Structure 1
Amino acid sequence: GAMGPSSVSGAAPFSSFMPPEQETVHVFIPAQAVGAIIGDDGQHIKQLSRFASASIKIAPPETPDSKVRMVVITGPPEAQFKAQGRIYGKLKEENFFGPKEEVKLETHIRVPASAAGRVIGKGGKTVNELQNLTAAEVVVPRDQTPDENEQVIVKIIGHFYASQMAQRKIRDILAQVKQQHQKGQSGQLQA
């Protein structure tokens, strides 16, 4: 029986992150490409937000290990495709990634912690089909604790069109999981 208040939790002065309005993708481009993207008087990002109909932020350093920086691509399926096309377009013009190859940028999208095997599929068939046929590769970290929403990240490395078919096959399987999570009882079912 409850008598006194148990667990409240407010704001943490240790870690603070601003949540966007609509749905969000987080696109990992080179830290040698932020000077590219923010570079034009700091007006190319203020450009992509008006231009791509989307809501673009730049994010701080991930880690010393990460030579990228994360771009906040918020907005509809139309405005999301319009903005990322530019960030893939800019590495396409400069080839910041690796002169010998073509654009292969990392995508972070929050997905449910016990649904991280849904995005990878049957053992590694969604990672195998995406890597080989799509060149966009699904990644889910080892020392991975979930977020607030009980959500973990997955990291695709592909082109604009490759991360396109990969990101969408992910949010669909993750939908079909959300279908099996909400919907359970169907028909009559005998014991």
Structure 2
Amino acid sequence: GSQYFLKVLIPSYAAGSIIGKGGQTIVQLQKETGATIKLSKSKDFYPGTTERVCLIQGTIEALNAVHGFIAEKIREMPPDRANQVKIIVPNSTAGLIIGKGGATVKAIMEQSGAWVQLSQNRVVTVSGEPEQNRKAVELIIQKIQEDP
């Protein structure tokens, strides 16, 4: 199957619950999706964040699924960040997500009901309700896929 990458920012309070005791949860998730998942270590934050990074590699569907799981776990806090997803895209993909004078991010936001913003990489922050975020991430991933 065709393999793709997704980098997601995880607040440190959520990492415990996505790895699980002795790694059980992350293993299961990797085994069930076929995805490979790597978190940066506890104090390895994305430049100018307090967030760890989660490298996911797998099929388009596995990326949406892994990210769906991560979102859920983040939604169970120890305020703004409860309902955001941040992902890291190459400048190339960043360019594709925006679109001619912002047409594309506007289309995405219409289709999702999410509020999407962009900060050699940029972080994309998606804002809204679970199903809204999940929808926008699907469109974003689709544009990760389509960039050669």
Give ranges in structure 2 of 5+ residues lacking alignment.
128-132
Specify whether residues 46 and 108 from structure 1 end up closer, same or farther in structure 2 by C-alpha distance, changes over 3 A only: same
State the TM-score, normalizing by the size of structure 2.
0.73
Contact 1:27 1:71 (8 Å CA) reproduced: yes
Contact kept, 8 Å, 1:130 with 1:138, in 2: the verdict is no
Residue 137 of structure 1: aligned partner: 116
Matches within 5 A, 1:12-161: 22-59=3-40, 60-63=44-47, 65-92=48-75, 94-95=76-77, 98=79, 103-112=83-92, 116-131=94-109, 133-134=111-112, 135-139=114-118, 141=119, 146=120, 152-158=121-127, 159-161=133-135
What is the rounded CA distance, in whole Å, between the counterparts of 1:108 and 1:24 in structure 2?
10
2: CA distance, partners of 1:116 / 1:105: 15
Normalized per residue, the structure richer in strand is: 2
Q: Which amino acid counterpart does residue 49 of structure 1 have in structure 2?
A: Q
Quick check: which one's helix share is greater?
A: 2
In structure 2, relative to structure 1, the CA distance for the partners of 1:26 and 1:42 (3 Å cut) is: same
Q: Which has the higher contact order (CA 8 A, sep 6+)?
A: 2
RMSD: 2.9
Q: How many residues align?
A: 138
Relative to 1, partners in 2 of residues 1:23 and 1:171: Cα closer, same or farther, differing over 3 Å? Answer: closer
CA distance in 2, matches of 1:155, 1:101: 13
CA distance in 2, matches of 1:45, 1:136: 29
Q: Structure 1 regions of 5+ residues with no counterpart? A: 1-21, 147-151, 179-191
TM-score, with normalisation over the residues of structure 1? 0.59
What's the offset of the Cα at 1:111?
4.8
